Design a protein around this ligand. Structure first.
Ligand code: O2N
Ligand code: O2N
Lengths: 150, 150
């Protein structure tokens, strides 16, 4: 669906990269935080849902599913908070391969900035613009614009 | 044009809110920083252009236009950096009205969070979702989707 996103948390350089993936398109937003907490996850989802029409979030683990602070942000922003269980088994693999691709890109730009957060945003840019043909950034806009026309 | 954005810097609580407005739709992204510097503005433009197809940015003042860090980020991300001179005088008033409206919304949410950055992101969400009839978040997706189908 146009409104469905998946949370994903990966580690690099002793830091955490929190990723939101729009499942239908593969488009992503990401940020670097010192560690995953409910307050950091809640703030990231509030940012995401002010930028895209976020209807459902599959959370990345049971601590973020349970967290009262995350539940409060999902309430505030009108998001249905769901678990992230790969009922479809091809979902573990899909996230795994995105983390590996992101980390590959980060390493390809890593010497172009001191701080990891800059490299991660260069990787977000390269990921979203990569043509596979349409890019993920093209796909998400097409999907949502098609939705709005209904 | 679908790719034209304008930077805007406003102050509150001794902090700076940097805003990027997509001119054709009124859609915005914003962040709080302790002060405007070339490095903060460059990082913010890198974030923006990994999320939307940013072709041109009208910078908010001549220091950000001149800044080599900002010029480096615009080169990296494929952005044409422009001045932000209101050759059309209505532009002045439009940005001022947007600052005033943002600050009004921030005041309306201010007690719902300790940190100003949370209130600013609540204000971004309310601004982008407000119907004027379409919202700014609907307008930007439809403008860009129409562009992609050319
Ligand atoms: C004085 C700037 C500080 N720093 C210097 C630095 C430190 C180490 C290595 C490189 C650099 C460097 O100069 N890279 C260029 C660059 C130039 C040519 C290239 O050609 C292939 C590629 C990249 C650059 C310019 C603007 C950018 O803006 C998006 C990002 C990167 C860059 C920086 C800016 C803003 C930030 C940062 C950082 C950071 O280092 O992380 O962190 C948060 O905001
Ligand atoms: C223990 C949490 C810390 N803090 C407590 C606090 C401190 C002061 C005032 C209120 C609160 C409060 O509990 N607000 C609820 C709330 C509950 C009911 C409502 O009904 C109208 C409206 C808002 C809230 C929950 C999750 C949110 O997530 C988007 C935002 C806000 C909220 C917070 C979280 C994450 C952050 C923050 C902050 C912050 O204070 O700025 O800053 C960066 O990431």
């Amino acid at each position: 669906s146009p409104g469905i996103w998946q949370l994903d948390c990966t580690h690099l350089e002793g830091k955490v990269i929190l990723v939101a993936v729009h499942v239908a398109s593969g488009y992503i937003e990401a940020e670097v935080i010192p560690a995953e907490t409910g307050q950091e996850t809640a703030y990231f989802l509030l940012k995401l849902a002010g930028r895209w029409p976020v209807k459902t979030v599959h959370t990345d683990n049971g601590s973020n599913f349970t967290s009262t602070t995350v539940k409060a942000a999902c309430w505030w922003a009108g998001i249905k908070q769901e678990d992230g269980i790969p009922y479809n088994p091809q979902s573990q693999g899909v996230i795994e391969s995105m983390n590996k691709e992101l980390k590959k890109i980060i390493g390809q730009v890593r010497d172009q900035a001191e701080h990891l957060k800059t490299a991660v945003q260069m990787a977000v840019f390269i990921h979203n613009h990569k043509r596979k043909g349409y890019s993920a950034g093209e796909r998400i806009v097409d999907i949502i614009a098609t939705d709005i026309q209904t």
